[PDB]
Amino acid sequence: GPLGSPGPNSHNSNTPGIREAGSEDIIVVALYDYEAIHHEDLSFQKGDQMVVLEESGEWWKARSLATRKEGYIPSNYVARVDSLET
Amino acid sequence: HSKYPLPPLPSL
């Protein structure tokens, strides 16, 4: 008896978990690489997008949207996806 | 927060 792959008695397909909206999910990107100079901060890399969660000062709470890490981050290091030149 | 007067930006 020759070899072969799996093969169930039925088949189906649909789109995957593709996202929506943006109005209340501040996607920023890191302008530069950062490595928590002082306590309670995220360490991110240049071109890490992050979902900002609080924005009330020069430092913002965010989550690395590539890796689901969280922390405060420097707003000078960073920039809204909606505000890029690309 | 405003814990520090921002980090020192890179060499660019």
Side-chain angles (χ1 to χ4, degrees), chain A residues 66-79:
Chain A
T67 57
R68 66 174 180 188
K69 295 175 185 285
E70 304 148 273
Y72 299 97
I73 58 137
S75 63
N76 81 329
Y77 255 55
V78 113

Side-chain angles (χ1 to χ4, degrees), chain A residues 6 11 17 28 38 50 66 70 74 77 79:
Chain A
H11 183 261
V28 119
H38 37 258
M50 304 173 262
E70 304 148 273
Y77 255 55

Side-chain angles (χ1 to χ4, degrees), chain A residues 34 37-38 44 58-59 73-77, chain B residues 4-10:
Chain A
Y34 188 72
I37 299 178
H38 37 258
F44 54 86
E58 308 196 300
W59 299 74
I73 58 137
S75 63
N76 81 329
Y77 255 55
Chain B
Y4 270 86
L6 286 160
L9 284 185

Side-chain angles (χ1 to χ4, degrees), chain A residues 19-56:
Chain A
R19 306 310 182 193
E20 289 188 273
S23 299
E24 59 179 90
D25 288 285
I26 300 277
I27 315 297
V28 119
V29 78
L31 299 188
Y32 326 112
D33 305 289
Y34 188 72
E35 210 182 271
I37 299 178
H38 37 258
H39 68 257
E40 211 170 47
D41 291 297
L42 230 193
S43 296
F44 54 86
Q45 281 184 291
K46 175 166 188 147
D48 193 36
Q49 273 117 301
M50 304 173 262
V51 177
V52 164
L53 308 175
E54 285 299 338
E55 169 196 274
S56 197

